[PDB]
Amino acid sequence: GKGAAKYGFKSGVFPTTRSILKSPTTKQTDIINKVKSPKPKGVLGIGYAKGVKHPKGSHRLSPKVNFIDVDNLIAKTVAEPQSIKSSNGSAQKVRLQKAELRRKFLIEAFRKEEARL
Amino acid sequence: FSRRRIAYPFYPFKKLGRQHPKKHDTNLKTAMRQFLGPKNYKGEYVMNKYFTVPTNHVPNYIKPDLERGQSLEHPVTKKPLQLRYDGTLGPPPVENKRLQNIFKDRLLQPFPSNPHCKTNYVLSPQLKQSIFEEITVEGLSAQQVSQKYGLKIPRVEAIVKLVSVENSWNRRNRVSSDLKTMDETLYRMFPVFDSDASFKRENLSEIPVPQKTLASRFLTIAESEPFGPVDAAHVLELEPAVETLRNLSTNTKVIYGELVEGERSQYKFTNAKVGKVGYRYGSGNRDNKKDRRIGFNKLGQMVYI
Amino acid sequence: TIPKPSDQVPDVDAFLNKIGRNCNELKDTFENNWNNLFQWDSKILKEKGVNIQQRKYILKQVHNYRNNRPIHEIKLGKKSFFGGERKRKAFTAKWKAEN
Amino acid sequence: TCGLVRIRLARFGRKNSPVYNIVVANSRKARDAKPIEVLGTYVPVPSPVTKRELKRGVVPIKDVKLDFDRTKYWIGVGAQPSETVTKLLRKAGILNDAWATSKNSRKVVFERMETL
Amino acid sequence: PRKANLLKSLARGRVRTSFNKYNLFNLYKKGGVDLKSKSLYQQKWTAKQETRAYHGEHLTEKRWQTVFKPKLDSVAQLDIKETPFLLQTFAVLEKRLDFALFRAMFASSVRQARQFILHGNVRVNGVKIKHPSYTLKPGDMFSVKPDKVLEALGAKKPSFQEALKIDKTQIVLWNKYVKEAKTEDPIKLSELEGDEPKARKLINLPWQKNYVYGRQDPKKPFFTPWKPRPFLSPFAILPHHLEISFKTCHAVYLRDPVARPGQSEVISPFDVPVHERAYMYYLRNGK
Amino acid sequence: VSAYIPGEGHDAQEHSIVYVRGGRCQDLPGVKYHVIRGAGDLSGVVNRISSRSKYGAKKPSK
Amino acid sequence: RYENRTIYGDIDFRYHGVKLHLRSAKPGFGLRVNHVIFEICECAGIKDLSGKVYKSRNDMNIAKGTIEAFTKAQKTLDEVALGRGKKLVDVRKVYYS
RNA sequence: UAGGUAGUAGGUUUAUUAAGAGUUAAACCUAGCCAACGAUCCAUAAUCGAUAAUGAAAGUUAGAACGAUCACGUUGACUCUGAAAUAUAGUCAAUAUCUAUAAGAUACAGCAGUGAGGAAUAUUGGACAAUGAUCGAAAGAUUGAUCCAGUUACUUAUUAGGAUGAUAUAUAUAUAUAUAUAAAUUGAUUAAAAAUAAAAUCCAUAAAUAAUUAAAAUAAUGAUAUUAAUUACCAUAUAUUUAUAUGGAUAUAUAUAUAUUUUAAUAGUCCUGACUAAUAUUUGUGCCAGCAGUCGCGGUAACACAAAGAGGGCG
Ligand SMILES: [Mg+2]
Ligand SMILES: [Mg+2]
Ligand SMILES: [Mg+2]
Ligand SMILES: [Mg+2]
Ligand SMILES: [Mg+2]
Ligand SMILES: [Mg+2]
Ligand SMILES: [Mg+2]
Ligand SMILES: [Mg+2]
Ligand SMILES: [Mg+2]
Ligand SMILES: [Mg+2]
Ligand SMILES: [Mg+2]
Ligand SMILES: [Mg+2]
Ligand SMILES: [Mg+2]
Ligand SMILES: [Mg+2]
Ligand SMILES: [Mg+2]
Ligand SMILES: [Mg+2]
Ligand SMILES: [Mg+2]
Ligand SMILES: [Mg+2]
Ligand SMILES: [Mg+2]
Ligand SMILES: [Mg+2]
Ligand SMILES: [Mg+2]
Ligand SMILES: [Mg+2]
Ligand SMILES: [Mg+2]
Ligand SMILES: [Mg+2]
Ligand SMILES: [Mg+2]
Ligand SMILES: [Mg+2]
Ligand SMILES: [Mg+2]
Ligand SMILES: [Mg+2]
């Protein structure tokens, strides 16, 4: 109870809210600019200095940040059906409806997230 | 140094001296009898000042310090009496100047030992009615009414609430004769609220005191540099006192479920942000502790929260 | 709402026989009244003095009949001839030794 | 139900007085264990109506505070709801008639609507 | 709760929340509470004794301690006398339903009020409550059944035999008076055992036409034409935090009682030093 | 352990079942224990009226 | 005494053995000090006081030390203002609580 | 426990791996690495929180309960499948019981329960109705997870009755009613009380007895369950929960005039020399018997032992 005052007197914990987009998007321009700007050197430097070598097996730089094209992601995860009009039977129709609903929701969620950030 | 002190009267009374072996009487009991005076065939202690109820708008509160414990008055004439060497009562030889000269404040002081506790005044029914009319028919704001009369806004609202209830009762014919008589007796007991008397009017600038104000601060400003209430509020990081007084004086997506003929209840879905909605995991079980939380239902049932 | 008795099971007794799980020996606690069986609920059955499991089963089969789903004795789950998953290894070995 | 990720009710509160915690969880993890994401609550005991209210003809309500957008997202990524949860969602108006099983399948009195 | 036992003894001059005759006498003959010639602890103990006897004698000590709030409340007038902060020690109990009912004078005592609400007579915002530990919010009405209020504030309804005996004496006195008037309607109680209508028929004085002294409406739970309680005056202290209407017996709880520059709204029969000592005690649980 | 035995009368042999608690007999040195008296072969102290639970004594029951 | 109820500043004073520490107090917060200090405050009109005695707690020396601290360790705001040549406002008073 | 370390510290390569690395295996070099800011070695211990305790707080304590993490499922090693296992699987060995006596089977740290150990910790319960889980296309099957009840003052909470109440007779539009005889418990003879305490009196309410009807769950399914709750002779029909009018229920006088189930109350335990709240006193013992957290008390006047009276806490 004593340590709950750090977290606004909240006894018990929730699980961490799980990011819908798990990397920065392409539309987040400022982040991209920050990433691509010249990395500093000297006292508060990041990488390796130009003259200095790096360990044989290891990479010199850090790996590049995979920026999500959101439209591309949507297309891949949630492809619209190519065979557009093939639909008979009740169970099949139900499945199709379910698929459509899932497409709608995940599309909306991603787009909203992109806008929201 | 504390003993067990039997609570005898501070005032003087006729103690026991000797008495017939069988009677087994106590000095406290004797003192109580004396205070009461003689009891009727009916049961009434008539000679006691405080037996009958005042019909004066002047509350008959207790003054044991002033009359020196001698409570007995003659019922018809309200003139004081004592217990003489004989068992019969009679008038006192010396008159009490303390009872004759008494203050305004102490007449509205129910307990002798606590000066701070005073009785609140009673509103006259006509005044209450006028207030009710003002709020409903004339359509005035409660603050204006409060300013006019000298009541507080919550008090005014309470009065209004009570008036409408009284009216409804009258319409239904629930206000019985015995109830009316009781109301009249209560009215007679208490002093009346005068809207003109400035000392009787309620102080309408009472804000409640916050935590930040109580903790004292001091500032060394230059000798000439001015520093008003606003500046003080700014230093403390509050809104000004006047603004708070003024304030005192003065969305979310909800769905409802479809209701089919057979089903017995709706489903109200309110929106809520994730990370703020649920019952938390590993919260403190407070049920076996004495700081356990006990709430109440819509039906007045006691429920563990 | 009362339903009609069908050709295959026109009687209460016939219905009981169909549903099974020892629903026979229950013709005395309620007599052969078609309306009676169907309108009756759980509390009434309990008062009469039937079992909990039997009560549950009958009501379910009544409901199925009302909805015109095929009622039949779907038997309760049975352990294997050898034994329950846990006890098999030993039991099977014992059985082998015997035979 | 099927799946690895599943939207279900985790039980909370005391004996003879349940409240439910709508979560998304792993199928393997326990019923009342800490989940992936709590989406909402659900008290099954309906709000008790007054005698006058009953006479008038006003139905009780079951309160279900719920993150709609999150739930939708979880449905989209393919987290199968439980039998009770899916019914609740259908009642709300997230899920369609498509999810309604044969047992569930009666004139409607009151229609759904969003309010504020 | 803590059982009622010797609440209104005289050898312990404990001033309880009641309108009892013995309680009144105790109040009368106490004077102050003497805190002279005592250690600090002894003073604190004597404060506890007196102050808790009035404020929540039914409450258990541990329970009280749990409910007891350190953070007292007050109001700045922003327009002089010194505010009595520490009279607020038992402000938290006025929030209770039972105490509020007592303050309203819908009960003779706090115990009685408690009993009333257990029996399901009080209401608060319509719904009837059977729970004394219920706490009013500001704006909440509460409403006792008017008969019970009348019983609380009315006289004790006499037994039939007692009433008949009282009547007999009154009749004799009347006869004596008429004899005295002449100079310058009998009843036999042994025969008339328990026939109330017969008694009514027999009796005819100027001040009661038929009804016996104590029974005009025997079915009602109080004295005859309703009159007040035998010592009602010295305890009729009209509170600030409640708005009352005695016709319907409704009452709006409008405020949590609070201390002003002049006064406190916690109605108590004890001076501020006593209340300070009590506060001191209950901060530390008598450490 | 050297255990004290309180009360007027003690029923204790050379083999009796006895329960020990952590008091201290202050005048006797090197004995830092009390036999708790209601339980075991140690019987409750007889004709005890005051402070009965401190010894074994049951309520006399009129 | 500040506002006719408590000391001005948080004083910390040594009288022989006894080390005194007396903090000022917000109004309503009572006397929360050693029994001797409390007794002296009751007589001297101090309503609000926090504090704690370190080292010796010799009753007599507490009584002597605390009155010395009151008379000597305290400086009134007005005196301080006069000495320094500055305004020394009390913010709470200005606010009107 | 003061020196420890020799795959040890680092370099170069090859295998193995999804993948880094003296992680293993192999090969060849350099002489390192850690340490008195505590190495190596030994002992003890599952770890933790927005959990529990305590404090003014910094902190300290617990790690039962709620939750998160680890490890183990009698002991040790290895193997297989697999994304992931030294798997509660299999293999072999170790310990100890079973028969069926066999390149057997079992291992309650799953739920009940038993014996033991111990100061000390529960039912060989009911139900899958709910919430989950596995199988199944479905029908619905299983579920000692779970939900319910049982035992246990271990903890918390709510109730566990209010108002009036110091005598008994007899006599005789007012009202201080007044006399007379009798009685009156333990103390005590006055500030020595016990005692408004009892008993009485007025008023309910619980429980009971009848009637009714939820909710947990609906498509249907209710273990809990003589369910919670409500009404008091039931229903409908007006108004604003109360009030009145109808319909029928009922029973005596002579269809319609007064009624309408019943009804209580019950607390221990510690203490009264000071610290420590407890002044009404008295008896027994006589440095004994005994008391005692601490200082102490008991040698005939014991406020301290053992009791009666009275009192003070908590309940
Ligand atoms: Mg499946
Ligand atoms: Mg003792
Ligand atoms: Mg005892
Ligand atoms: Mg190594
Ligand atoms: Mg090597
Ligand atoms: Mg390598
Ligand atoms: Mg070491
Ligand atoms: Mg261990
Ligand atoms: Mg720790
Ligand atoms: Mg744990
Ligand atoms: Mg630890
Ligand atoms: Mg455990
Ligand atoms: Mg293992
Ligand atoms: Mg192992
Ligand atoms: Mg077991
Ligand atoms: Mg084992
Ligand atoms: Mg044993
Ligand atoms: Mg235990
Ligand atoms: Mg199940
Ligand atoms: Mg089972
Ligand atoms: Mg308790
Ligand atoms: Mg005697
Ligand atoms: Mg009942
Ligand atoms: Mg003392
Ligand atoms: Mg003696
Ligand atoms: Mg002692
Ligand atoms: Mg003694
Ligand atoms: Mg005694």
mmCIF file with all atom_site columns, N, CA, C and O in Angstrom, chain D residues 9-23:
data_model
loop_
_atom_site.group_PDB
_atom_site.id
_atom_site.type_symbol
_atom_site.label_atom_id
_atom_site.label_alt_id
_atom_site.label_comp_id
_atom_site.label_asym_id
_atom_site.label_entity_id
_atom_site.label_seq_id
_atom_site.pdbx_PDB_ins_code
_atom_site.Cartn_x
_atom_site.Cartn_y
_atom_site.Cartn_z
_atom_site.occupancy
_atom_site.B_iso_or_equiv
_atom_site.pdbx_formal_charge
_atom_site.auth_seq_id
_atom_site.auth_comp_id
_atom_site.auth_asym_id
_atom_site.auth_atom_id
_atom_site.pdbx_PDB_model_num
ATOM 1  N N  . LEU D 1 9  ? -13.974 -14.012 -20.202 1.00 0.00 ? 9  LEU D N  1
ATOM 2  C CA . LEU D 1 9  ? -14.245 -13.404 -18.898 1.00 0.00 ? 9  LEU D CA 1
ATOM 3  C C  . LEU D 1 9  ? -13.373 -14.024 -17.807 1.00 0.00 ? 9  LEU D C  1
ATOM 4  O O  . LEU D 1 9  ? -13.442 -15.231 -17.565 1.00 0.00 ? 9  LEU D O  1
ATOM 5  N N  . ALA D 1 10 ? -12.546 -13.196 -17.170 1.00 0.00 ? 10 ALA D N  1
ATOM 6  C CA . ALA D 1 10 ? -11.826 -13.574 -15.952 1.00 0.00 ? 10 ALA D CA 1
ATOM 7  C C  . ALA D 1 10 ? -12.674 -13.167 -14.752 1.00 0.00 ? 10 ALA D C  1
ATOM 8  O O  . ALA D 1 10 ? -13.142 -12.029 -14.686 1.00 0.00 ? 10 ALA D O  1
ATOM 9  N N  . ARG D 1 11 ? -12.866 -14.085 -13.805 1.00 0.00 ? 11 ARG D N  1
ATOM 10 C CA . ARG D 1 11 ? -13.731 -13.827 -12.651 1.00 0.00 ? 11 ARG D CA 1
ATOM 11 C C  . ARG D 1 11 ? -13.026 -12.976 -11.594 1.00 0.00 ? 11 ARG D C  1
ATOM 12 O O  . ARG D 1 11 ? -11.839 -13.154 -11.322 1.00 0.00 ? 11 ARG D O  1
ATOM 13 N N  . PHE D 1 12 ? -13.783 -12.053 -11.006 1.00 0.00 ? 12 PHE D N  1
ATOM 14 C CA . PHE D 1 12 ? -13.308 -11.202 -9.918  1.00 0.00 ? 12 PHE D CA 1
ATOM 15 C C  . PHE D 1 12 ? -14.391 -11.066 -8.853  1.00 0.00 ? 12 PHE D C  1
ATOM 16 O O  . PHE D 1 12 ? -15.503 -11.579 -9.012  1.00 0.00 ? 12 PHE D O  1
ATOM 17 N N  . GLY D 1 13 ? -14.053 -10.384 -7.764  1.00 0.00 ? 13 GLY D N  1
ATOM 18 C CA . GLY D 1 13 ? -14.987 -10.156 -6.669  1.00 0.00 ? 13 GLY D CA 1
ATOM 19 C C  . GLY D 1 13 ? -15.029 -11.322 -5.701  1.00 0.00 ? 13 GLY D C  1
ATOM 20 O O  . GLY D 1 13 ? -14.107 -12.140 -5.650  1.00 0.00 ? 13 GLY D O  1
ATOM 21 N N  . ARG D 1 14 ? -16.122 -11.392 -4.946  1.00 0.00 ? 14 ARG D N  1
ATOM 22 C CA . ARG D 1 14 ? -16.261 -12.312 -3.819  1.00 0.00 ? 14 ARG D CA 1
ATOM 23 C C  . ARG D 1 14 ? -17.209 -13.468 -4.134  1.00 0.00 ? 14 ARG D C  1
ATOM 24 O O  . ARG D 1 14 ? -17.814 -13.518 -5.209  1.00 0.00 ? 14 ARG D O  1
ATOM 25 N N  . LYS D 1 15 ? -17.312 -14.399 -3.186  1.00 0.00 ? 15 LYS D N  1
ATOM 26 C CA . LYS D 1 15 ? -18.278 -15.501 -3.242  1.00 0.00 ? 15 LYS D CA 1
ATOM 27 C C  . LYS D 1 15 ? -19.717 -14.989 -3.276  1.00 0.00 ? 15 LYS D C  1
ATOM 28 O O  . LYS D 1 15 ? -20.038 -13.974 -2.651  1.00 0.00 ? 15 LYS D O  1
ATOM 29 N N  . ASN D 1 16 ? -20.570 -15.712 -4.003  1.00 0.00 ? 16 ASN D N  1
ATOM 30 C CA . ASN D 1 16 ? -21.986 -15.369 -4.201  1.00 0.00 ? 16 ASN D CA 1
ATOM 31 C C  . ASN D 1 16 ? -22.242 -13.949 -4.737  1.00 0.00 ? 16 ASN D C  1
ATOM 32 O O  . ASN D 1 16 ? -23.327 -13.392 -4.544  1.00 0.00 ? 16 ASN D O  1
ATOM 33 N N  . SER D 1 17 ? -21.254 -13.380 -5.428  1.00 0.00 ? 17 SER D N  1
ATOM 34 C CA . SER D 1 17 ? -21.301 -11.981 -5.865  1.00 0.00 ? 17 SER D CA 1
ATOM 35 C C  . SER D 1 17 ? -20.207 -11.724 -6.908  1.00 0.00 ? 17 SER D C  1
ATOM 36 O O  . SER D 1 17 ? -19.255 -10.978 -6.650  1.00 0.00 ? 17 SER D O  1
ATOM 37 N N  . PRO D 1 18 ? -20.335 -12.351 -8.093  1.00 0.00 ? 18 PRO D N  1
ATOM 38 C CA . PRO D 1 18 ? -19.294 -12.240 -9.107  1.00 0.00 ? 18 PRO D CA 1
ATOM 39 C C  . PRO D 1 18 ? -19.346 -10.940 -9.896  1.00 0.00 ? 18 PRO D C  1
ATOM 40 O O  . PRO D 1 18 ? -20.427 -10.413 -10.165 1.00 0.00 ? 18 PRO D O  1
ATOM 41 N N  . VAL D 1 19 ? -18.166 -10.432 -10.234 1.00 0.00 ? 19 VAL D N  1
ATOM 42 C CA . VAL D 1 19 ? -17.991 -9.464  -11.314 1.00 0.00 ? 19 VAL D CA 1
ATOM 43 C C  . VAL D 1 19 ? -16.981 -10.080 -12.267 1.00 0.00 ? 19 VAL D C  1
ATOM 44 O O  . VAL D 1 19 ? -16.120 -10.859 -11.847 1.00 0.00 ? 19 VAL D O  1
ATOM 45 N N  . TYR D 1 20 ? -17.088 -9.731  -13.542 1.00 0.00 ? 20 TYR D N  1
ATOM 46 C CA . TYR D 1 20 ? -16.217 -10.296 -14.562 1.00 0.00 ? 20 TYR D CA 1
ATOM 47 C C  . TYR D 1 20 ? -15.348 -9.243  -15.214 1.00 0.00 ? 20 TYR D C  1
ATOM 48 O O  . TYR D 1 20 ? -15.720 -8.074  -15.316 1.00 0.00 ? 20 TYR D O  1
ATOM 49 N N  . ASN D 1 21 ? -14.180 -9.702  -15.645 1.00 0.00 ? 21 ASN D N  1
ATOM 50 C CA . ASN D 1 21 ? -13.152 -8.880  -16.232 1.00 0.00 ? 21 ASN D CA 1
ATOM 51 C C  . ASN D 1 21 ? -12.931 -9.431  -17.639 1.00 0.00 ? 21 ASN D C  1
ATOM 52 O O  . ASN D 1 21 ? -12.334 -10.498 -17.807 1.00 0.00 ? 21 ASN D O  1
ATOM 53 N N  . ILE D 1 22 ? -13.455 -8.719  -18.637 1.00 0.00 ? 22 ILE D N  1
ATOM 54 C CA . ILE D 1 22 ? -13.304 -9.103  -20.040 1.00 0.00 ? 22 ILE D CA 1
ATOM 55 C C  . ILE D 1 22 ? -11.849 -8.868  -20.418 1.00 0.00 ? 22 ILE D C  1
ATOM 56 O O  . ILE D 1 22 ? -11.362 -7.738  -20.336 1.00 0.00 ? 22 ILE D O  1
ATOM 57 N N  . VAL D 1 23 ? -11.170 -9.935  -20.829 1.00 0.00 ? 23 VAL D N  1
ATOM 58 C CA . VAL D 1 23 ? -9.748  -9.874  -21.164 1.00 0.00 ? 23 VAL D CA 1
ATOM 59 C C  . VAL D 1 23 ? -9.501  -10.454 -22.542 1.00 0.00 ? 23 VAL D C  1
ATOM 60 O O  . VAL D 1 23 ? -10.409 -11.003 -23.162 1.00 0.00 ? 23 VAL D O  1
#
